Amino acid sequence: LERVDPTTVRQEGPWADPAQAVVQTGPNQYTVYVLAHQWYYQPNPIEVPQGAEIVFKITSADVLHGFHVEGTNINVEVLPGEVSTVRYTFKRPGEYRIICSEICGTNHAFMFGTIVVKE
Ligand code: CUA
Numbered sequence: 001l002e003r004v005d006p007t008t009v010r011q012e013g014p015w016a017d018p019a020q021a022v023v024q025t026g027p028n029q030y031t032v033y034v035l036a037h038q039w040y041y042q043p044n045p046i047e048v049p050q051g052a053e054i055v056f057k058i059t060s061a062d063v064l065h066g067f068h069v070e071g072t073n074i075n076v077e078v079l080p081g082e083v084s085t086v087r088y089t090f091k092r093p094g095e096y097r098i099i100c101s102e103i104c105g106t107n108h109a110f111m112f113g114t115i116v117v118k119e
Contacts, residue, residue: 006080034058036065039107045114050093056086066101090117
């Protein structure tokens, strides 16, 4: 179990700078640091290449959230203080909706993101 401090994740560590969310970690491998908030995803959109292995590293800045990529079997709970890891290779270019699968308050019904898979 991989633990982080939710009260400092916006200020120190790999989720602190939103411009640095996508990091190449092998010839055809990218790690993506996703930070869920009430009520949006950081970064948005997430842009990745077709056929590369993606390693998502997902945590929460406040309350329990969900992270589900429509059209795949990616569906994880996202807890403050914990890192959820998911590995996946996207074979078809195009756009996929990201949906929050855990009730999280006022604007839960509007918490959407996007992943763009480039040709
Ligand atoms: Cu985040 Cu519902």
